[PDB]
């Protein structure tokens, strides 16, 4: 599907994540699979209650992801032709 | 489910005849017998309308205290009352017992 | 070295309790048959959470564990 292919097209760019637990992981996307589980590099974390920390590497399960924010300039990307 | 010719015995009356006198139960049968034709699908809608009701294993009729059955046969008559009525075009108030019997018996 | 499926094949028509995951309710009864998903059928079951229940079908997702 196109929605996952756009996530593969976002590799190497700063993205935002909302886990269904309520946290927010914003940072640079290293890897992504077709199971939507991604791993991110040099990422700032916001706990559900707002406490913010910083971690160098993270791997998240795709089932727990809620929405992913992708750099806007991918809107006109050829997937949408 | 029978692929072969055979004789099978079953009781049409079931609970109602066992509860209520024999003259009246045939009459409640005939009120039903006219009705299920006029109840194309609402039969299973009205007969099962009280889900507390269950059919006994030996028996055919839904076994019940027989008060809703008097309500069931009355609702069913009104469905017969309108369907006989609409084809000839009669008012529901114009319907009388001599007409209501003529609907039942004809 | 028994695995789950032969363990259910060995527990057929034996008295088995089954604990669901919710209220800590367990149905105690003679197992009848099981599906691929481990759906359960029971005869003469009793609900413990005190009652007596003639026949039971239990869907696979709600069971916690099965014991004899």
């Amino acid at each position: 599907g196109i929605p996952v292919k756009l996530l593969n097209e976002a590799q190497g760019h700063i993205v935002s994540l909302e886990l269904t637990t309520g946290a927010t992981y914003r940072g640079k996307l290293v890897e992504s699979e077709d199971s939507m589980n991604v791993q991110l590099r040099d990422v700032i974390a916001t706990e559900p209650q707002g406490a913010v920390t910083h971690m160098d590497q993270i791997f998240v399960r795709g089932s727990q992801i809620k929405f992913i924010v992708v750099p806007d300039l991918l809107k006109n990307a050829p997937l949408f032709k | 489910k029978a692929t072969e010719p055979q004789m099978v015995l079953f009781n049409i009356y079931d609970d109602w005849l066992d509860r209520i006198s024999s003259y009246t139960a045939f009459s409640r049968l005939t009120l039903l017998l006219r009705a299920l034709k006029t109840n194309e699908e609402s039969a299973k809608m009205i007969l099962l309308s009280d889900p507390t009701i269950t059919i006994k294993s030996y028996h055919l009729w839904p076994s019940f205290t027989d008060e809703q059955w008097i309500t069931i046969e009355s609702q069913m008559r009104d469905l017969i009352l309108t369907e006989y009525g609409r084809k000839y075009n009669v008012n529901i108030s114009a319907l009388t017992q001599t007409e209501i019997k003529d609907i039942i018996l004809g | 070295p028994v695995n789950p499926k032969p363990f259910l094949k060995g527990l057929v028509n034996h008295r088995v309790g089954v604990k669901l995951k919710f209220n800590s309710t367990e149905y105690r009864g003679t197992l009848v048959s099981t599906d691929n998903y481990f759906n359960l059928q029971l005869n003469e079951a009793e609900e413990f959470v005190h009652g007596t229940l003639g026949e039971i079908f239990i869907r696979c997702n709600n069971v916690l564990y099965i014991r004899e």
Binding site: - | E40, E41, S42, M45 | -
Partner: protein, 108 residues
């Protein structure tokens, strides 16, 4: 057998789709996907009132209901009316279909 293929013959009928939230949707029914995704047309979707000394209703369903944009300001009780709601399949709990249709023809 997939019983969802039954719902696909219920098209253009008045129906209530009663969801997992407790939210109930009255509407005219359109094509039902094989995953039971149900798409309706003219729908009044609401939440029942548990009375029980005014016990608090679903807190998530009220927010999701106001956020459809269809709840009008002057509604005293909790309802919303809108056109074209599309419902994911896994959200459905019960479906109350009309009394008129006969099952013996449609269940084949």
């Amino acid at each position: 057998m997939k019983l969802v293929n039954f719902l696909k013959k219920l098209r253009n009928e008045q129906v209530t789709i009663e969801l997992k939230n407790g939210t109930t949707v009255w509407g005219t029914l359109q094509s039902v996907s094989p995953q039971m995704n149900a798409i309706l047309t003219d729908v009044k979707l609401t939440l029942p009132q548990p009375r029980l000394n005014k016990l608090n209703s679903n807190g998530i369903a009220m927010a999701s209901l106001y956020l459809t944009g269809g709840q009008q300001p002057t509604a005293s009780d909790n309802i919303a009316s809108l056109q074209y709601i599309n419902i994911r399949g896994n959200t459905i709990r019960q479906i109350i279909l009309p009394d008129s249709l006969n099952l013996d023809s449609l269940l084949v």
